[PDB]
């Protein structure tokens, strides 16, 4: 190396039992530290924080058939934003019905057409899910 410690890449590629030997060889005593922080690094952070149920990857519906999407929030009084491909899904008559059963927001879409065939995003701040409806005609 040019004149560096190098110990980082060296320990990174070193056998696990030899970490302390190699660390102290380069002056490092916190090999344990690099390990412990990495345990927090690989520490699972499952998503769906404000969501209790996110939309499925996709949904298939028959054209002229009613389908409904289901999202659950982690809070009862919190609301979702409804976007289809980037446009706010508004309740058009009895075609788009937001049924909120507690924290569970179920969007029932009556008579899905090819115009309904779009990606739906239920956006909560920090949590959104984009499901893609496939309307089979």
């Amino acid at each position: 190396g040019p004149g560096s410690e190098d110990v980082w890449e060296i320990l990174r590629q070193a056998p696990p039992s030899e970490y302390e030997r190699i660390a102290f060889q380069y002056g490092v005593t916190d090999l344990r530290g690099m390990l412990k922080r990495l345990k927090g690094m690989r520490r699972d952070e499952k998503k769906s924080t404000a969501f209790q149920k996110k939309l499925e990857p996709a949904y298939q519906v028959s054209k002229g058939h009613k389908i409904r999407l289901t999202v659950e929030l982690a809070d009862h009084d919190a609301e979702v934003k409804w976007l289809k491909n980037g446009q706010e899904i508004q309740m058009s008559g009895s075609k788009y019905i937001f049924e909120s059963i507690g924290a569970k927001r179920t969007l029932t879409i009556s008579q899905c057409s090819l115009a309904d065939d779009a990606a739906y995003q239920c956006v909560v701040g920090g949590e959104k899910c984009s499901t893609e409806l496939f309307v089979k005609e």
Side-chain angles (χ1 to χ4, degrees):
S4 41
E5 310 161 291
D6 296 78
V7 60
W8 316 101
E9 59 176 83
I10 295 176
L11 288 177
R12 193 76 61 178
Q13 300 173 149
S17 182
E18 300 295 272
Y19 293 154
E20 182 173 80
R21 191 194 314 271
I22 305 162
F24 282 93
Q25 179 179 91
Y26 292 96
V28 188
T29 169
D30 291 274
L31 64 304
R32 170 183 57 185
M34 183 176 64
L35 297 177
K36 73 181 190 63
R37 61 176 60 188
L38 195 75
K39 296 190 297 177
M41 183 60 60
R42 66 182 185 184
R43 168 278 310 201
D44 292 92
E45 293 192 84
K46 270 71 180 187
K47 190 163 292 301
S48 325
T49 56
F51 263 139
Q52 185 178 270
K53 186 63 56 58
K54 299 168 69 69
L55 299 166
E56 293 289 279
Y59 289 85
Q60 181 259 209
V61 67
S62 309
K63 193 282 293 181
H65 179 97
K66 179 192 66 175
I67 195 175
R68 65 200 306 232
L69 305 318
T70 306
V71 288
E72 295 166 49
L73 295 75
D75 186 274
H76 285 241
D77 185 66
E79 66 175 77
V80 283
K81 294 294 298 179
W82 307 266
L83 277 69
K84 64 167 168 61
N85 69 87
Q87 176 60 30
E88 292 183 65
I89 306 175
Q90 63 184 272
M91 290 180 59
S92 311
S94 308
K95 175 173 177 61
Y96 290 108
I97 304 176
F98 302 142
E99 307 184 273
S100 35
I101 314 299
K104 173 175 176 169
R105 268 63 178 172
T106 312
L107 166 57
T108 300
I109 305 177
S110 312
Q111 306 305 272
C112 302
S113 59
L114 300 177
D116 296 285
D117 182 277
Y120 305 131
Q121 292 87 152
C122 300
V123 187
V124 183
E127 284 291 328
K128 70 173 185 177
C129 183
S130 316
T131 193
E132 188 168 284
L133 183 65
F134 188 88
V135 181
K136 181 179 297 178
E137 181 184 73

